[PDB]
Amino acid sequence: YKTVIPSPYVKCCGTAECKDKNLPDYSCKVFTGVYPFMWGGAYCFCDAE
Amino acid sequence: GQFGDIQSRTPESKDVYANTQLVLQRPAAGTVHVPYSQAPSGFKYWLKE
Amino acid sequence: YEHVTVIPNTVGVPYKTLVNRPGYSPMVLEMELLSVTLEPTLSLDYITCEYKTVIPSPYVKCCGTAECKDKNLPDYSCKVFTGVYPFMWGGAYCFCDAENTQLSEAHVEKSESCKTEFASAYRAHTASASAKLRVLYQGNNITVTAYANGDHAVTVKDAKFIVGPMSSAWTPFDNKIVVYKGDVYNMDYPPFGAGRPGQFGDIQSRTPESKDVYANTQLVLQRPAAGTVHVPYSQAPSGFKYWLKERGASLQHTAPFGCQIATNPVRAVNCAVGNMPISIDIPEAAFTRVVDAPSLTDMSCEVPACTHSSDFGGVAIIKYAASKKGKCAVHSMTNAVTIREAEIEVEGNSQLQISFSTALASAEFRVQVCSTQVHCAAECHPPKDHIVNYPAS
Amino acid sequence: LSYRNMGEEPNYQEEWVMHKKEVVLTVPTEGLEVTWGNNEPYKYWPQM
Amino acid sequence: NVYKATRPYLAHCPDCGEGHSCHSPVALERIRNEATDGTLKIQVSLQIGIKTDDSHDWTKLRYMDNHMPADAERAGLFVRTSAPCTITGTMGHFILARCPKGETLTVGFTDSRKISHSCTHPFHHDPPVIGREKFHSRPQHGKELPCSTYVQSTAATTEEIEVHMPPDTPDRTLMSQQSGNVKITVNGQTVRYKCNCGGSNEGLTTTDKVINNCKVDQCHAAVTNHKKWQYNSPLVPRNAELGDRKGKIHIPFPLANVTCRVPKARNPTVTYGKNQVIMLLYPDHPTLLSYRNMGEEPNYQEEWVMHKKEVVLTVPTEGLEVTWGNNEPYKYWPQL
Amino acid sequence: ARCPKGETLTVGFTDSRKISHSCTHPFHHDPPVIGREKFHSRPQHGKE
Amino acid sequence: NVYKATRPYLAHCPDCGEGHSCHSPVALERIRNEATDGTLKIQVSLQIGIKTDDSHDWTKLRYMDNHMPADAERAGLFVRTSAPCTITGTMGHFILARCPKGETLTVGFTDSRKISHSCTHPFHHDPPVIGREKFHSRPQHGKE
C-alpha cells in the first residue's frame, strides 16, 4: 500500500477545519498551539494561536 | 498488518479497500512533519512468512 | 456541624456522603482522592558507587632491593619482584642483569563519579500518610492537601478538614531499601563493613562527599612481563557496575495495589490499601432549616431503559408535585443502585430524568428526592461486553 | 514489554520484544497495567 | 525541458553529524526499497547533474547555500550504511545505490568552500538474499530466477511526484537588530515583510527598510519568486496564500520485474545404507535443507544448514525426496 | 596483506589514464581462533 | 599554558597494525564509558593541544619520538571502532568521541615524517539502552 500524505496546512494566527473526504482509510486531525520553525526562523507570527 | 489489509479487484482497478489502522500524531516542537501510527504492510509481511 | 466519614484508600473513585443535621435539610458531599502519599522515615546506612584503583609509578630499583611499607589505606596491596630486567625507548633502564627489584604498590579509593553516580542504602522504619482530596462543596470543587495523621486541620471555605489517621500500615517498602536516581529496590543489602568483592557493597562510604571508605575488592599484584614497565593486577570487577546491569524491575513496576514510587523524598503515591477516615466540620451558615425547604407528593417512577453494567446503564423518569422552587438532593436508599445526580431543581407539577448504575437483573430500588421517597421498578438487561476497562462499586 | 496486576499479587514479568509477536495476557478484577517501551502505561480493567 | 519550471531547495535533517540536528542541503526525503535485487531509490534535497544556470553537466552538483543555489562536485557525493555504497545512477533529487547490511543510511557531499555536509536517517537495510546462495560477485552465466530492479529509462512514464509553488522563501538572515530597531537587508532581492510593531508593518520592498522600536522575533521576512516550481516536501513549509493547489511531474527510474542469475549449492558427500541415506553437508552460506516422503504421509521437515553437518534420513518403500538449496530435488529409492 | 573479517576479497589499482580497475572474488576471510579464549587484541606477555 | 611544565612520554601497545605489538606513542591506557548518552573518555600516551616548548595550540599535537618529544597535526588524529568516530573534545591525554557499534577501539595520528601510528584495543562498544528502545541512530526530536 501507499500512504499518500500531502503538505500539512499550517494556519498562522487562526484555526483550520477537517473536511470529511470519501477516500480509503482517510484520516484527518487539527493540532492547536503549534509553533513551527523553518530555515530563517519561525513560520508563524502568533505564539499559541 | 495481515494478508488482505489492502484489497483491490484487479492490478489496474480504480476503487480499493483499505484497513491499515492509520492514526495521526502531534508534530515535534518547532518541526513541520506529519507523524503517524500505522500497521506495516500485510503483503510485505506475508512474502516473508 | 462535625461530619465523620470513612472512605477506601482508592485514588480516582468519587464517593458521595449524606450529611443529615437534625432539623436541617440534607446535604450531599462528593469526595475524591487525587493522591495518597506514604512517606517512610529513612536512615542512611551507607552509599555505594564505582571504585578507583589508584596505582602510582612503580619503583624500579636498579642494582638493589626495595622494601614494602605497611600503609593504612583501603585495600592496600604491596609486592617486590626480584630479578627484573625492564626496557625503555633507548634500551635497558637498569645496569645489573639479575640484581634489580620492582616495588608494586596499590590501593582502592572512591571514584570521581561517586558525587553523581551512586546508590543509597536506606533503613525504612515507620511511614507518615498524607492526602490530596477533591470536595464538591456548595456546587464548587475545592482542593484539600493535609497529613493523614488525624491531627493536621486545614480550613477551606470556612470548613475544617481533618484527614487521617491511616487505617492500614502496609507499605510497599521493607526494613531495608536501595535508592538509585528515580528507582527504589527492596534489597537485603550487606551491612556496613561486611561487603564482598564483585557484589553490591564491594566499596562502602557514609556519604558521596565522605573522607573514609570501606573496600573489599580482592586486589592482588602480578609479576610484570619480560622487559616491560607496568603494574599487572587481579581484581574482582565493580559490584555497583554489575548491579546496575543485573537489578531488574524497581518497586514502581513490581509493587502490589498499583503503587507509584516517587523519589526525593522517597514515598509511595496512590496505593489502594486499607481505608481512610475524614472529618468535615461544616459551618452552620451552610445549612438551611428544613421547614424552609420544599416538599413533594404523589410521585411515580418509570424506567424506560436499563442495562446492568459498571457504568450508568439505566435511565429513570420521576414525576412529582412540589410546593415551591428550590434545590432537592437525589440519593438511592438501596446499596445495590447508585445515582449520577447529586442535586436537581424542582418547581411544581413536573418530572426529572436520572442516570443510574446497578448489577442486578431485577432491580427494585427506593430513590430519596429531597425528603420524600419513591419506589422504582426496573428489569435491566445484560451488556455486550463481559470485561470492562474501568472499576465500579 | 512489561506487565503487572493492580492488586495484592503484582507478579511482574519482563521481556525484550524484537520480532513480530502476538501476546495473550489475562486481565483480573483488580486490573492489568502494561508498559510498552517509552510509552505511558496502558491500564486495562475487566467488564461484562 | 521539464526542468524550466523545476528548481532546487533546502530542508531539515535529524543528523548532520555527531548526532546534531540542522538545516542540511543534502536532507533525506524518501528511501524506496521496492526492488528485490537490492537497489535503493534515495530522494535528496539537492539536485545532481544540473548547474545553477539550468544546464546539463554530469560532473556538477546543485545545492542550496544560504538563500542562493551554488555548484559542487559529483565526485564528492557519497552514500553509506555501515560501509560505503556504489552509486549506480544520479539525476536531480534521485540517487541509485547498492548498500550492505546497515541500520542507518548516510548521504553526503563536498561544497566549493571544501566543507562536507551529510544527513543520517535510521533505516533498517537488509535485502532478501536472491536464491539459496550468499555470493558476492554476480555471475555472467547461471540459474535464471525472477527478481526486480530500477531501470535506466529517462522517458516520462508510470511513476510521478507532486510539485507545488515555493511562494516566498523564508529567511531570518534578512532581519538584523540595529540597536533598538529592526533593519531588513534586501541585497538586490524582492522581500515581503510583516511586523507586530506600529507604523509600517506590511509590504513588498525592493529597498533597505528599517522598523523603529521593534524586536527581530516580532518580525518575519522572505524572498519572493512565484515563478519557479517546487516538490511537495514535508521538510519545507506550505505556501500561506494557497490551499491544496499543486502540480505533478513524471519521474525517471521505475520498478520493473527482471531476471537474475544466481548459483547452486555444491553436492554433498552421499553414502547409502540399509533403508537410510547419509549426507555430509558443507555450506559456504546459509543453505535450506528440506525432505519429504513420496507416499500417503509426506511428513515435511525443514532446517537451515550453516555449519558442517551429517544427516541420517530414513528411506521408505514409496521413496524419499530431498531438496538441498536451489538444486533440483534428489530422488531416492530403497530395495531390497 | 593483513585483512579484517570479510566475505569478498577486492584487489585494485589506478592506471596512467587515471582509470581505476578492481577485481572482486567471494572469499570467506576470518582468522582462526587459537587457545580457549576468543580475544581481539594480542597480548605482549601471556601463555605460550 | 599549563603545558610548559608538563610533558609527554611513551608506552606499550598490543596492536600497532596488522596484529603486531610494539611501543606506540598513541598507546591506549583507559577507555571510560560511564556516560549514558554514548560519549567515550579515551586516555592516550601522547598530549593534544600543547607544543614541545610548553605552549597552547589547538591545531598542534605532542607525541614521543625516540627519546625526544616531537610536534604533529590535530587534523591527523583519528578514532574508530568499525567506522570512523566524531571527536568532540581534545586536551592532553584525553579524547572525547561518539562511536558506533564495535568490538575493537582504534586510536591513531600522523607525524611530521608523514608516518601513521595507530593502537588497537579489544573493547565491546554498545551504548547502553537509554530508555526502553534499542535504537542505532539518535533522533533530533523525541522523549526527554
Automatic annotation (TrEMBL), chain A:
Intracellular or extracellular location(s): Host Golgi apparatus, Host trans-Golgi network; Host cell membrane; Host cytoplasm; Host endoplasmic reticulum
S-S bonds: 12-44, 13-46, 18-28
Function text: Acts as a viroporin that participates in virus glycoprotein processing and transport to the plasma membrane, cell permeabilization and budding of viral particles. Disrupts the calcium homeostasis of the cell, probably at the endoplasmic reticulum level. This leads to cytoplasmic calcium elevation. Because of its lipophilic properties, the 6K protein is postulated to influence the selection of lipids that interact with the transmembrane domains of the glycoproteins, which, in turn, affects the deformability of the bilayer required for the extreme curvature that occurs as budding proceeds. Provides the signal sequence for the translocation of the precursor of protein E3/E2 to the host endoplasmic reticulum. Furin-cleaved E3 remains associated with spike glycoprotein E1 and mediates pH protection of the latter during the transport via the secretory pathway. After virion release from the host cell, the assembly protein E3 is gradually released in the extracellular space.
Subunit structure: Oligomer. Interacts with spike glycoprotein E1. Interacts with spike glycoprotein E2.
Protein name as catalogued: Structural polyprotein
Originating species: Chikungunya virus
Residues of the full protein shown: 860 to 908 of 1248
